[PDB]
Design an enzyme around this catalytic site. Sequence first.
Site, PDB file in Angstrom:
ATOM      1  N   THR E  29       0.825  -1.195   0.000  1.00  0.00           N
ATOM      2  CA  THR E  29       0.000   0.000   0.000  1.00  0.00           C
ATOM      3  C   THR E  29       0.859   1.245   0.000  1.00  0.00           C
ATOM      4  O   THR E  29       2.024   1.238   0.403  1.00  0.00           O
ATOM      5  CB  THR E  29      -0.936   0.067   1.206  1.00  0.00           C
ATOM      6  OG1 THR E  29      -0.221  -0.238   2.410  1.00  0.00           O
ATOM      7  CG2 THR E  29      -2.081  -0.882   1.018  1.00  0.00           C
ATOM      8  N   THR E  30       0.252   2.333  -0.435  1.00  0.00           N
ATOM      9  CA  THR E  30       0.935   3.603  -0.396  1.00  0.00           C
ATOM     10  C   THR E  30       0.860   4.152   1.013  1.00  0.00           C
ATOM     11  O   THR E  30      -0.214   4.211   1.621  1.00  0.00           O
ATOM     12  CB  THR E  30       0.335   4.597  -1.375  1.00  0.00           C
ATOM     13  OG1 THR E  30       0.257   4.000  -2.674  1.00  0.00           O
ATOM     14  CG2 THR E  30       1.218   5.822  -1.433  1.00  0.00           C
TER      15      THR E  30
END
Lengths: 249, 226, 244, 241, 242, 196, 217
Positions: E29-30
Amino acid sequence: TDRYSFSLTTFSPSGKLGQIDYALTAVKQGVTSLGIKATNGVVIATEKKSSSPLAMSETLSKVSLLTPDIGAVYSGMGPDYRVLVDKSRKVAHTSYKRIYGEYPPTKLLVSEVAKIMQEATQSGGVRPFGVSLLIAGHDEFNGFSLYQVDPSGSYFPWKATAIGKGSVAAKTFLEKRWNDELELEDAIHIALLTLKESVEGEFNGDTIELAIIGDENPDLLGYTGIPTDKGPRFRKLTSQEINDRLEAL
Amino acid sequence: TTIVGVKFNNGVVIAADTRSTQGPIVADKNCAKLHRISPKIWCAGAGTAADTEAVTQLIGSNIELHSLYTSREPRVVSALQMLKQHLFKYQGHIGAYLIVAGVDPTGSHLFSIHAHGSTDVGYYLSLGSGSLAAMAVLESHWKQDLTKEEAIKLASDAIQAGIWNDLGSGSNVDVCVMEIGKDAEYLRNYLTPNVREEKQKSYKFPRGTTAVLKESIVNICDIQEE
Amino acid sequence: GSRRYDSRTTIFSPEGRLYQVEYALESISHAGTAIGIMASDGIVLAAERKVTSTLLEQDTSTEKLYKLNDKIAVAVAGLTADAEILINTARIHAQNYLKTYNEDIPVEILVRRLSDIKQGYTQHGGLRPFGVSFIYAGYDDRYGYQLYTSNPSGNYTGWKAISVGANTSAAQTLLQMDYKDDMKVDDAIELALKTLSKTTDSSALTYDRLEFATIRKGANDGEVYQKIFKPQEIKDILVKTGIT
Amino acid sequence: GYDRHITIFSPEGRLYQVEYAFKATNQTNINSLAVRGKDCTVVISQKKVPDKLLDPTTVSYIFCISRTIGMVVNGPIPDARNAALRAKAEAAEFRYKYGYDMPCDVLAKRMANLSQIYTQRAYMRPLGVILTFVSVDEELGPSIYKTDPAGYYVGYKATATGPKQQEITTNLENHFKKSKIDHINEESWEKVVEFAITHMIDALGTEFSKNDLEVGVATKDKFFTLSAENIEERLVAIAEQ
Amino acid sequence: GYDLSNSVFSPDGRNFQVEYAVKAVENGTTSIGIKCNDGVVFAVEKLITSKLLVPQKNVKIQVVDRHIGCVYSGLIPDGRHLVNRGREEAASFKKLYKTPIPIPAFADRLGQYVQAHTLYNSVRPFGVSTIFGGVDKNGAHLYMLEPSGSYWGYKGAATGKGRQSAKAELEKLVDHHPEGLSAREAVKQAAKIIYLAHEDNKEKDFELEISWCSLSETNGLHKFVKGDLLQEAIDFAQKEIN
Amino acid sequence: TSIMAVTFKDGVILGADSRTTTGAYIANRVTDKLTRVHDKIWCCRSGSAADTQAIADIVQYHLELYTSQYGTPSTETAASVFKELCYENKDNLTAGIIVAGYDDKNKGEVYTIPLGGSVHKLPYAIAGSGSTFIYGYCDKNFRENMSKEETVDFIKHSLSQAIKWDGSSGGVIRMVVLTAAGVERLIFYPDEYEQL
Amino acid sequence: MSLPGSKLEEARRLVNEKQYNEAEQVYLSLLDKDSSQSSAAAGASVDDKRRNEQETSILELGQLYVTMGAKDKLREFIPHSTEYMMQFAKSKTVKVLKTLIEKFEQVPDSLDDQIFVCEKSIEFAKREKRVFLKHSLSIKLATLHYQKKQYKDSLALINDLLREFKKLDDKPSLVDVHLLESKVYHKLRNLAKSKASLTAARTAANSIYCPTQTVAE
């Protein structure tokens, strides 16, 4: 975990334990060192090589003391010898300074050190060390002795021998110079002359390490006034003195 | 016994007696009570004898290692530190009353160490059972910055007082003078203040004045060929 | 990984045979000869070194002959290095028997123990066996003089005369043809030397290449005196048998 | 073969796996230079901050092992912190059991043994960092010891590290051949810092900033680091010579 | 060859098992972290793979100590175990020295730990990059920790698929405030650049989470962002990208 | 043995005797009990000699490592290590330790550690055997935030009464001053505080 | 120890500071002094082992000799300085004897004197001493025959070393002989085997141990 308890020494399909043969090769990649046994001393000598011209060969030790009366010198890998000399000292102390009290016979100690070599060819997570040691010494029982410890974990007494990359040439050199009776001084000349042919750099007395297990010297013990007790039969020669010796070849 | 150690500006002197008592029985007329942790680091021992001797054997090996690793003179406090830790976890069930003396390139040093693992410093220290008698004589004559010769004397006299007011102190007085930047000078039997008086007749008898039952020969000289 | 760097060295082969043991016998045939003969007055152990060099000292070399106890000695054929460990184990096992029973260890027991260690290496741990063959001279009070040969697998077999090391074939046959059961220590001393001169890895057998040792019952009262001869006495006996 | 994948000898007697460990310290592009002054030892080393988004004050290649001994590391940063930790534990260890601070000489020897132990196993990866220990000891005087992945170590008059360190080495060797002693004479440690910078600029061909350098100084009984401001002071003094 | 363990080494000077582990987080994930003056503001993109999930129940933000925020990306079980160890470390320090561990101290310890599993063929490395920071008496600190065992000082950091999208904006944000900026304002920022790094995650939909440790509002403790402040940030980011 | 430390304006002053008894024999009378475990945090030993020295060595070992990785310890931080080793030997070891130090995170601080191990912050601390007789004098005559000279003389006066009433406290009085002006060792010979 | 040192110093100051004819008397007493040390006439003048003196006496006897000045006394001295070498009965005679002849070579004496002294040395080197020594002193005599411009005497000597010393061969001392050999052949004006033997000398020096002088030659 621990799954490395399978020996890393094995046999080859053509006989001959392959690992200690490779370890014996590393000695022919190593420096040259030699020992000439006299009949009133022993001399050991080695050459100092460094990887820098700014390196200090004044804190570089390739000839090291085990007990006052016994010295050692290697040919082969530096790192391997650096740990191995500490283990030699350690067993000598725990088994002959806490049990038998006095400094061991030369013959005894040589056997004991060969056992550690043996125990690096038995177990997993350890392959053997790739140096050969010359252990020169004197005990008052078996006299002067010069021994050679193998990377196989055997020992041999020699009359004169060399180890290193120039070992084969050196024993041929020693054939004609050697005699059953030698003085200690003459031994110094023979030793350094053979090692001059096994060095392909420049041959100084600042870059050549000389030590004798020759004459006692009391003032290197640390005390005086009981002559029944001496100081070290080992005596390292300082650099300026070795320069005097280059002229005496 | 009695052990004195006197520190002074230029070095240190450790002196001891050679009478070995077990109990009120005198084990030995002569015995060396000066021991070697290291060739520059001498001590002597009081209290029980076997425990002092054992622990200086044990720490002598560890220091000897250390001296090889550095390839130069072993520091005094290395020995001190190791003794202390060793004794502390027995909590003083090992009776070692040592006066630890030594010189090194960070000066003169003088320590004492107890069974429990206590350590003291001083410019002079005294241990054993005769410590008390030694004390008194020292503290009158002692000055700051003694001469080596003067210090010699004062040490020997203090042990002498031990001989005269203590029953663990006796036969010979040995001294070891350790000076900075030289070799330690072991002056054995520096002062011999007591001889066995002469007897008045010799104690010989002819043979078989003791009865003998039988005899046999007994060989250890080897083994035998045929 | 860790199973990625092991190919499995100490399993059986498809003939029921341990890879490492089979390789070991070959490496012991590289090493010098050692012969054991049993006389009805003794046992002779005679060993030829696997190294002889330009300036090797062999005048004090006690590198094949070892006293395990004062009635049991061994001759070594194989790696000298490998042999060390078991030599000192044997010393310990022998002294232990004396310590707790107040009696000298039988030859049978001592050998059977060492064989177990060898068997133990391929049984567990992934470890290789020591490539060693021993010839045991031993005296006990139950089978008298006993002669044994042991191999790197961990098995013992009795003999009247046996050879190990280099050139076992040639030596074995000559020993069978010439040995009689009424030989003495004198006869056996000469027979061993002749057999070693047909198996010498040089072209001559020399006194400083010989280690020679006996256990003799000529010592008084029937006691066994072990003698490892001095280099001048080996030279002494070698001119007597007429090799040199 | 597979004598190059685990640390087992070849038919040359060579450990290829170990040799590879040296080959990774060029990948961070960090050079260091360390010389013995008259009463000090100075080490100056590069500091790469390729972005803004890296905060430059934190980017440190200098780890204090002792109060008196600094350590500057050339090579990958994980292995650097790992090596620093071992060394710190051992220094403290010796102070506890021997009653003085661990000698620089003995610390170098210690890490050499541990390095050998990481090449003694056959599933352990050598710590690829090259370590420089700088000190002023009271028994050995000014000292530099550089340990390496194989577990070889040797003392040093001066030393350099990095992909471009031959050039630096050339400079230093020539200086000690004119001076004919193994340490720079001056008498203010500040001017030994300045001299060291001059040789570095010559060697790598680039003038440095106060955030392209990070500087460590060991004087007697102490090690500290110069802040980025102090370094700018030195670069004015280049003008002043 | 040289791709079967983590204690081979190549003649190139490269360890590929270790390098390969960074790619694990690259598919994660960012997550971003803004280093402020008063503190730090973390934000993490939470991907929505269905609408059966319960948003803000699936935690990636775990607090370590009472003042160190930790949020991680990459292989999730692995990262939860890395935080697991670090809580033990927190308690140990507190036990011996009776004070909460410092921010630099915690960074140090985790680096050692991730080092250990790339030195043996008997343990497996991690597959996460973690972002953590806080406030101590030495100031606010921000660190990113690679699965190689590397960390540095960070003005701003990111990781995940959209680490590029994030970092490009952080450069401009140091242009807007070359003196650094306030934690309170950085909350709105934090949302902004996750929306910008959701343009690499524009075939999915997302849930925004934000957490902060700042000395000027929360008294230097690590807390969550929620309620009225949260929805202000969500609204801000929306209008900008629309 | 008696030890004390007292806070003042600009830092903290530590005060000790140098006499160490076992039984009726004084082993030595010039052994310093003021011990350095950091440049800036010193501590004071009292009670059984071995116990306190042992713990002091351990704490120095741990604080060294603290400095080389995490930055310097605070006075607080240091007190805890003493405390916690005493908590692990609370049935075995009887130790009186006062940990005092001058920080710039916290200016002067006094923490004290009993036999069983607890840490206690106080504006002044006393511990030992002989310092319990001077306890009442301490509190009646104490002042918050004194001058440097006033602190030096207060410690001198407290320990004079201590030596008065306790034969195990004697010898010289030794003091260490911790400040942002330097570190000042002081020594008072017996005639100098017998006049008073 | 103090007496042989003081007598040596005394000679030296007179040489450079007073007169070279007062040093002459001290020289003659110095040589006789050296004989006392050599025969152990007190214990070698140190009492009981020859200790330090053993080395010192033949070392100060050659220091005297080179100092010095071409004198008939100097010439006369040297013939009986090779008996003084056997007088000791020590095993250290190998090292010093080479420098002894060399010092006499240095000083101009003329055709006869340098050669006769060196040949005499060879006679005592086959008595009991090392095989290495004789070969060294043959190398020296060979060089002398070439200096005095005799090339039949040089050639004949050289052949017996090189041809029969492959059974007593480990030495780097045949490199010297090949180079000399080429020089002899050059001055007989036969360049065929001067070239062949030079190549052999070059190849025999292609292995790395060789002095600077050796390559210069």
